Amino acid sequence: DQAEITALTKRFETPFYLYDGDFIEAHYRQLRSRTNPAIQFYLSLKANNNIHLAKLFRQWGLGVEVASAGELALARHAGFSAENIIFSGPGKKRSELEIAVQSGIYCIIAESVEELFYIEELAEKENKTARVAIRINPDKSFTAIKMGGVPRQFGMDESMLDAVMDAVRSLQFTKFIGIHVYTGTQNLNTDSIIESMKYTVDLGRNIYERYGIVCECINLGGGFGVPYFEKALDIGKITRTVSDYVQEARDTRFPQTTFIIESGRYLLAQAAVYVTEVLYRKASKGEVFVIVDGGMHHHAASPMEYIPLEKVTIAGPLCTPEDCLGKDVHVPALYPGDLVCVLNSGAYGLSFSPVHFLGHPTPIEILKRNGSYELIRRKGTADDIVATQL
Amino acid sequence: DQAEITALTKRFETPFYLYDGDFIEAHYRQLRSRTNPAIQFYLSLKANNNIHLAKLFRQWGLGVEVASAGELALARHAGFSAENIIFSGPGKKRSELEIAVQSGIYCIIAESVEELFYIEELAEKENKTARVAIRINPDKSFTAIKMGGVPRQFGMDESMLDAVMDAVRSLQFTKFIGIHVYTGTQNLNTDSIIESMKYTVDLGRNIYERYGIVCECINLGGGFGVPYFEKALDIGKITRTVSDYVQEARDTRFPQTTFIIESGRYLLAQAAVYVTEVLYRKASKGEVFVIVDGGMHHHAASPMEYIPLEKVTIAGPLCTPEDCLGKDVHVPALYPGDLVCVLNSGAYGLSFSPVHFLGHPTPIEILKRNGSYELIRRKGTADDIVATQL
């Protein structure tokens, strides 16, 4: 609603992120309703580090997937219980593993045998039983030319499962809880997702057949993409097919197994708009440039809507040609005071950007819900920048 | 010195930035000695926002070029006097212009006629005389196909000088102090720099001939690049030729004019190394991956040195394939504990990166000088992340 947005800029200084909390909830509940109850959704915190948004998901029953001790802290700030937190990452420091073990979370998802040994040492030191899952890099490709999967820095190749399981079994203070497969972000190929998830459920079966172990948790990953430029995923097909496959596993060998589908982008991308005001308008060498008050330092990832036709380039306030929101775009003439709205800015936005580049204040974040507006992140200050320097 | 670096990792937690302050000073003094004294060097703060490093340049007599009210604050923290601060930028908010006018800095470098009018309004409100310079986008190309310059969001086309000067003259509380030309960063073409600078000095002459005004300040910009992959600029030729050209102007129409050469990258790039420790080593689909504890969140821009041959990919600790320091690089086998050093990391490093992406602590920065080591930026904390959220 342009009228709503315009009215908001009178009370909140641009540039800012505006989140539609009503949409976030409806969008999530629609996904939840179509998915087998044995599958629990986990919010990927790296997609958006705002604890106020994370709290909403916590209240709805989602778990949270963190990738650092820092995110673990944010997750606790958001109220996620330890039993609903999993720790992923290819380069966890021992200090991070230490805090994770001390926190007694659902599980640390190990990505190397050496990591498993570190966890065991820490479990012994802390006199605790550390829960671990293993991230597997499938030896299968889900357009791909070569068979056998892709070389990745993440997890451990499926072919190394024997070595991995031998290690986990030898670590007396560690308990194996399951597996995790995540093939990448912004996946817009419906069948590739279904195939990967079914493959992961099958890996669970292989583990029982080869080791007699029943995975307590099978994390199917996800990487559900959202169209930015592109067709949307057939969420109905994914949820229906995977739910049926999971139920079959549930009705046989995995009656008490928790299945997880992780999501960052799909849950939040379309729920926010980045609102920026046009500051200046100029012509240069036959072209027209419109300079707005927001940019790369707030939304590096950067559809757009304009609030009051020509070829124009929309640039941010930074001193670099890279701060371009739109090059040679055709839109009605924009003038100082007009608002440029960047759509689908709810994921990989603020925290994905070089917030301190050129010293501009970080943007305000607003959450709209139940007919009200809540400030969920204050405007940054110069002191926020020098904090680590003084 | 590998021995030095190794010893430092015992006292300082990796990943961290290490700056050779002895080099910074020697490097600067060599540049200074070869340059006409009528030319003053200005540090571009956006290249590195550490006030402790900026202070060194302030002590040596350099001015500072800021691009936001935030950087203006940092400049004052570093001790730069108002008369040695200039404010650049294509999208300055009125609030930024207000603080700039209230600070009485050497000059605000305007990039539009509308900006000039805003400055005048503020000068009137604050009962002050605002000093302004104008950023000109030359109608000349300095390999380029088309003549006449390039369309840019920065400054005002040279062809609009009449309109610009008519505006400045009509603003009674504003004093015109000069011009500024900056063609871009990482310029490794020696002659293009010399040509641009001479062209800028000539613009000063044109302004006197057409308006009878003598520029108090002519900012030649710079954009001196440094080789990362490439041949180094012939600094000797640039300093000699431009110095002679400036002296000629000095001996005729511009006897008391301050000439400025700005630099960010050239002054700091080669003075720092980003030190990261190898955490894990693994093989995946026939390839070898080495995971280090530093990455994109600290040095997004990313030569490298290794401290104890194969084809290997060096990846950071982030949960994204984009966190790659080196792909398919040939280097002696790296193992956990080894150190990977990223060279020429002194400019566009930390503040140019998405520091809060995935919640890892910002890195420590160390300054080596006169045989000692000084901590110039403490390790980040989870509280630094939630500050704006609570």
Ligand SMILES: *Cc1c(COP(=O)(O)O)cnc(C)c1O
């Ligand atoms: C980033 C990440 C996610 C979330 O991905 P989206 O594409 O945002 O849904 C899930 N799992 C892991 C292991 C991740 O690193």
Ligand SMILES: *Cc1c(COP(=O)(O)O)cnc(C)c1O
């Ligand atoms: C970034 C910038 C500089 C510094 O550029 P370097 O390439 O780092 O020397 C100088 N002047 C302006 C106007 C800038 O925006």
